[PDB]
Recover the amino acids of this structure.
């Protein structure tokens, strides 16, 4: 089970189609051949940014996964661990959020790099079946008190355009849906990656 | 001022944390302070009379808490770490 928790990106500007920096986030799409190959496996799920080398400082976005997956916490209890894209970012924090996590970063200049921002260890249940798709969602959220971020150190006009791109075009959502066949079959085209098991029907 | 809101836009978020960290890195290398008056006061969230990466870490952690369980005010969160 997953739900579509993402919200409509509604700050000014909301059209990032002319952003100098067009950050794209890719999420692991792990596919197992058989239920027996998948059952009880822990998969490292990477959240990997491209096109924003040296262009960002301040990030914060939501991750959710199918409720049937079991997260394997870090030694500190965190559900996500920072990756190489964040190695030059002095501030990095993951807060747990049920079947999900909130991941945030900060830097004293535009030290954000391309590559793996975060990883999440997700374990496939013992009763996994051929055909199962466990979707993994990156989502924008906002409320009047605060919202998700992908901006530069000064939070410049270009950083706000880059943020608009990141949330509207850089990640999948109900307004930018996946066409990946696994997510279509999962009825989760708002999601971004997955752990799947092949159905292997003629 | 609102504690934690160093850009005074009514929101405590990662931009506040990055701003405190940026000020700390500038001062550390000997540049002049840019945080004065109520900005300086807003940055010192643990009330230890200095602005450093512990303040920036606290703002970011509040931003992440408010983004998840959201079960404590910013003022109560920063008071947990202030001197009795
Ligand atoms: Ca999504
Ligand atoms: Ca603020
Ligand atoms: Ca302080």
């Amino acid at each position: 089970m997953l739900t579509d928790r993402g919200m409509t990106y509604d700050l000014d500007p909301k059209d990032g189609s002319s952003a100098a920096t067009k950050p794209v986030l890719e999420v692991t799409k792990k596919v197992f051949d058989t239920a027996a190959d998948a059952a009880g496996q822990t998969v490292t799920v990477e959240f990997k940014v491209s096109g924003a080398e040296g262009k960002y400082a301040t990030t914060g976005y939501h991750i959710y996964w199918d409720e049937r997956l079991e997260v394997v916490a870090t030694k500190t209890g965190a559900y996500a661990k920072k990756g190489a894209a964040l190695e030059d970012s002095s501030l990095a924090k993951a807060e747990n959020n049920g079947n999900g996590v909130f991941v945030a970063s900060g830097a004293d200049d535009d030290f954000g790099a391309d590559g793996v921002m975060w990883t999440v260890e997700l374990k496939v249940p013992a009763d996994a079946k051929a055909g199962d798709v466990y979707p993994i969602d990156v989502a924008y959220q906002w409320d009047p008190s605060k919202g998700d971020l992908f901006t530069d150190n000064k939070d410049s006009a270009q950083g706000k355009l880059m943020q608009a791109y990141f949330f509207t075009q850089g990640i999948k959502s109900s307004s930018n849906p996946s066409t990946d066949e696994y997510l279509v079959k999962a009825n989760a085209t708002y999601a971004d990656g997955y752990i799947a098991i092949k159905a292997g029907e003629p | 001022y609102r504690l934690g809101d160093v850009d005074f836009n009514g929101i405590i978020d990662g931009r506040d944390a990055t701003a405190v960290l940026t000020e700390y890195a500038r001062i550390s290398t000997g540049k002049p302070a840019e945080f004065v008056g109520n900005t300086a006061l807003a940055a010192d969230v643990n009330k230890d009379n200095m602005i450093d990466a512990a303040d920036a870490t606290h703002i970011l952690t509040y931003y992440a808490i408010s983004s998840t369980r959201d079960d404590i005010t910013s003022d109560d969160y920063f008071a947990l770490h202030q001197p009795l």
Observations:
- Chain A has three helices and 14 strands.
- Residues 1-202 of chain A form one domain.
